[PDB]
């Protein structure tokens, strides 16, 4: 039982809670490869 | 039982709580490879 | 039971609490490889 995993998550704008601020992402460019050989 | 894992997460704008500030990401460029051989 | 893990996380803009300031990332360039052989 062999199990190979490649992961890369992209979360941009996230707020969370359990129980002013300025956040800017200006022009992101992504050339990023997910290769499995 | 063999299990190979490659991980690389990308979270840009994150706030969190459990119970002014300025954050700027200007033009990020990403050439970053996820190779599994 | 063999288990090989490669990890590299990217968190850019993070605030957190449990119970003015200026943070600038200007033009980050990332050529960084995740290889598993």
Author numbering:
A (entry chain B), B (entry chain A), C (entry chain C): 274 to 292, 304 to 321
Give sentences copied directly from the paper behind this entry.
The ordered assembly of tau protein into amyloid filaments defines a number of neurodegenerative diseases, also known as tauopathies; they are the most common proteinopathies of the human nervous system. The physiological function of tau is to promote the assembly, and possibly stability, of microtubules. Here, we used cryo-EM to determine the structures of heparin-induced filaments assembled from recombinant full-length 4R tau (2N4R, 441 amino acid isoform) and the corresponding 3R isoform (2N3R, 410 amino acid isoform) to resolutions sufficient for de novo atomic modelling. Our results show that heparin-induced 2N4R filaments consist of a mixture of at least four different conformations, whereas heparin-induced 2N3R filaments mainly adopt a single conformation.
Twister filaments have an almost constant width of 80 Å, and a crossover distance that is approximately two times shorter (~250 Å) than that of the snake filaments. The twister filament reconstruction, with an overall resolution of 3.3 Å and a helical twist of −3.38°, also allowed de novo atomic modelling. The ordered core of the twister filament is smaller than that of the snake filament, and is positioned much closer to the helical axis. The ordered core comprises only residues 274–321, i.e. the last residue of R1, all of R2 and half of R3. As in the snake filament, these are organised into a kinked hairpin structure of two cross-β stacks connected by a hammerhead arc. In the core, there are four β-strands, two from R2: β1 (274–284) and β2 (286–291), and two from R3: β3 (305–310) and β4 (313–321). In contrast, on the R2 side of the hairpin, the inner corner of the kink is formed by S285 and N286, extending β1 and shortening β2, compared to the snake filament. The change of R2 secondary structure in the twister filament reverses the interior/exterior orientations of four residues: the polar side-chains of D283 and S285 point towards the inside of the core, whereas hydrophobic residues L282 and L284 point outwards. This results in the twister filament core having a more polar interior, and a more hydrophobic exterior than that of the snake. Therefore, we chose not to build an atomic model of residues 293–303 in this part of the structure.
